Enzyme design. Structure first.
Site, short mmCIF file in Angstrom:
data_model
loop_
_atom_site.label_atom_id
_atom_site.label_comp_id
_atom_site.label_asym_id
_atom_site.label_seq_id
_atom_site.Cartn_x
_atom_site.Cartn_y
_atom_site.Cartn_z
N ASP A 25 0.80 -1.23 0.00
CA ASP A 25 0.00 0.00 0.00
C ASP A 25 0.82 1.26 0.00
O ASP A 25 1.26 1.73 1.08
CB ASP A 25 -0.94 -0.05 1.23
N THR A 26 1.04 1.83 -1.20
CA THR A 26 1.84 3.07 -1.27
C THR A 26 1.11 4.25 -0.64
O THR A 26 1.84 5.23 -0.38
CB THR A 26 2.16 3.40 -2.75
N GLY A 27 -0.17 4.15 -0.43
CA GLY A 27 -0.94 5.18 0.27
C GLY A 27 -1.01 4.97 1.79
O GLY A 27 -1.80 5.67 2.43
C1 LIG Z 1 2.85 5.88 13.47
C2 LIG Z 1 2.08 7.19 13.55
C3 LIG Z 1 0.73 7.00 12.86
C4 LIG Z 1 -0.04 8.32 12.77
C5 LIG Z 1 -1.37 8.15 12.04
N1 LIG Z 1 -1.14 7.93 10.61
C6 LIG Z 1 -2.17 7.63 9.79
O1 LIG Z 1 -3.31 7.47 10.22
C7 LIG Z 1 -1.88 7.55 8.29
C8 LIG Z 1 -1.92 8.97 7.73
N2 LIG Z 1 -2.87 6.72 7.62
C9 LIG Z 1 -2.65 6.23 6.41
O2 LIG Z 1 -1.69 6.40 5.69
C10 LIG Z 1 -3.68 5.17 6.03
C11 LIG Z 1 -3.16 3.80 6.45
C12 LIG Z 1 -2.92 3.58 7.94
C13 LIG Z 1 -1.51 3.94 8.37
O3 LIG Z 1 -0.61 3.90 7.49
O4 LIG Z 1 -1.35 4.39 9.52
N3 LIG Z 1 -3.91 5.26 4.59
C14 LIG Z 1 -5.11 4.94 4.08
O5 LIG Z 1 -6.01 4.53 4.82
C15 LIG Z 1 -5.30 5.15 2.58
C16 LIG Z 1 -5.98 6.50 2.34
C17 LIG Z 1 -5.35 7.65 3.12
C18 LIG Z 1 -4.21 8.27 2.68
C19 LIG Z 1 -3.65 9.31 3.39
C20 LIG Z 1 -4.19 9.76 4.58
C21 LIG Z 1 -5.36 9.15 5.02
C22 LIG Z 1 -5.92 8.13 4.29
N4 LIG Z 1 -6.08 4.07 1.97
C23 LIG Z 1 -5.78 2.80 2.29
C24 LIG Z 1 -6.88 1.74 2.22
C25 LIG Z 1 -6.35 0.31 2.34
C26 LIG Z 1 -7.48 -0.67 2.74
C27 LIG Z 1 -6.90 -2.03 3.08
C28 LIG Z 1 -8.29 -0.03 3.86
N5 LIG Z 1 -7.65 1.87 0.99
C29 LIG Z 1 -8.89 2.34 1.03
O6 LIG Z 1 -9.44 2.67 2.09
C30 LIG Z 1 -9.64 2.40 -0.27
N6 LIG Z 1 -10.77 1.48 -0.22
C31 LIG Z 1 -10.97 0.44 -1.01
O7 LIG Z 1 -10.15 0.10 -1.87
C32 LIG Z 1 -12.27 -0.32 -0.81
N7 LIG Z 1 -12.88 -0.72 -2.08
C33 LIG Z 1 -12.07 -1.60 0.03
C34 LIG Z 1 -13.27 -1.76 0.97
C35 LIG Z 1 -12.97 -2.68 2.15
N8 LIG Z 1 -13.57 -3.98 1.90
C36 LIG Z 1 -13.14 -5.17 2.25
N9 LIG Z 1 -12.02 -5.32 2.95
N10 LIG Z 1 -13.87 -6.23 1.90
C37 LIG Z 1 -10.19 3.81 -0.55
C38 LIG Z 1 -9.11 4.86 -0.53
C39 LIG Z 1 -10.88 3.76 -1.91
C40 LIG Z 1 -2.23 9.38 12.36
N11 LIG Z 1 -2.33 10.29 11.52
O8 LIG Z 1 -2.94 9.36 13.41
#
Ligand SMILES: CCCC[C@H](NC(=O)[C@H](C)NC(=O)[C@H](CCC(=O)O)NC(=O)[C@H](Cc1ccccc1)NC[C@H](CC(C)C)NC(=O)[C@@H](NC(=O)[C@@H](N)CCCNC(N)=[NH2+])C(C)C)C(N)=O
EC number: 3.4.23.16
Lengths: 99, 99
Positions: A25-27
Site C-alpha cells: 500500500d503506497t498510500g
Molecule cells: C505511526 C504514527 C501514525 C499516525 C497516524 N497515521 C495515519 O493514520 C496515516 C496517515 N494513515 C494512512 O496512511 C492510512 C493507512 C494507515 C496507516 O498507514 O497508519 N492510509 C489509508 O487509509 C489510505 C488513504 C489515506 C491516505 C492518506 C491519509 C489518510 C488516508 N487508503 C488505504 C486503504 C487500504 C485498505 C486495506 C483499507 N484503501 C482504502 O481505504 C480504499 N478502499 C478500497 O479500496 C475499498 N474498495 C475496500 C473496501 C474494504 N472492503 C473489504 N475489505 N472487503 C479507498 C481509498 C478507496 C495518524 N495520523 O494518526
C-alpha cells in the site's frame, strides 16, 4: 519482481513466526497487521484513513519478511480490514512505483 | 518516472479542468477526490477504508490527468482525508510496483 495493479497487490509475509497475506500500500505511511498475539511491549496509538480512526498497538523493531525480502521496523496491530504493508517497510525492500 | 517511497507519492492531477494534488495509492481499488464541483452525472454509493464506510458520489467516464498521463474512468467524490488515485486509474497509466 514487478507487480501489476489489475488486482490487489497481495504478497506473502512472515511475521511473529506466521505466514500471512498482505497488501502492498503506497498510500499507507505505516504497516498495519490484523490482530495477532505478538510478544513484548507496545504503545497504544490511533491511525486514520477513510472512514475514521482505529485503535492499534505500536510495536517497534519487529522482524518481517515481505515477498522474500527481510525488513525490520514498526508494526501496528489491531482491527484492520486488511494486512497492509506501508511505506515505512516498502522503502526498506527498495519498492518503487513506475510508469 | 520511477518514484521511491521515502515520502508520500504525491503528484499533480487535473480534473474538471482544475489542478489538484493526489496520492498514488496501490492499496485503493478506486479513486477518491475531495468534495468539488465536477461536470458530469453521478450516483451515490458507499466505500470502505481503514476506519469504516463513507458516502461518496460516483462519476463515470471522467477525464483526469495524472502526472501528465491521461486517464478516463470512475472518480468518487466525497469527504476523504486525501485525494487518492487508486488502481482503476493507476492501471490506465501503466503503473506497476517494482522491487
Ligand atoms: C505511526 C504514527 C501514525 C499516525 C497516524 N497515521 C495515519 O493514520 C496515516 C496517515 N494513515 C494512512 O496512511 C492510512 C493507512 C494507515 C496507516 O498507514 O497508519 N492510509 C489509508 O487509509 C489510505 C488513504 C489515506 C491516505 C492518506 C491519509 C489518510 C488516508 N487508503 C488505504 C486503504 C487500504 C485498505 C486495506 C483499507 N484503501 C482504502 O481505504 C480504499 N478502499 C478500497 O479500496 C475499498 N474498495 C475496500 C473496501 C474494504 N472492503 C473489504 N475489505 N472487503 C479507498 C481509498 C478507496 C495518524 N495520523 O494518526
Amino acid at each position: 519482481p514487478q507487480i501489476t495493479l489489475w488486482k490487489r497487490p497481495l504478497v506473502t509475509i512472515k511475521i511473529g513466526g506466521q505466514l500471512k497475506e498482505a497488501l502492498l500500500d503506497t498510500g499507507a505511511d505505516d504497516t498495519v497487521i490484523e490482530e495477532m498475539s505478538l510478544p513484548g511491549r507496545w504503545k497504544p496509538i490511533m491511525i486514520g484513513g477513510i472512514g475514521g480512526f482505529i485503535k492499534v498497538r505500536q510495536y517497534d523493531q519487529i522482524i518481517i519478511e515481505i515477498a522474500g525480502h527481510k525488513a525490520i521496523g514498526t508494526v501496528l496491530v489491531g482491527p484492520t480490514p486488511s494486512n497492509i504493508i506501508g511505506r515505512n517497510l516498502l522503502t526498506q525492500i527498495g519498492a518503487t512505483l513506475n510508469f
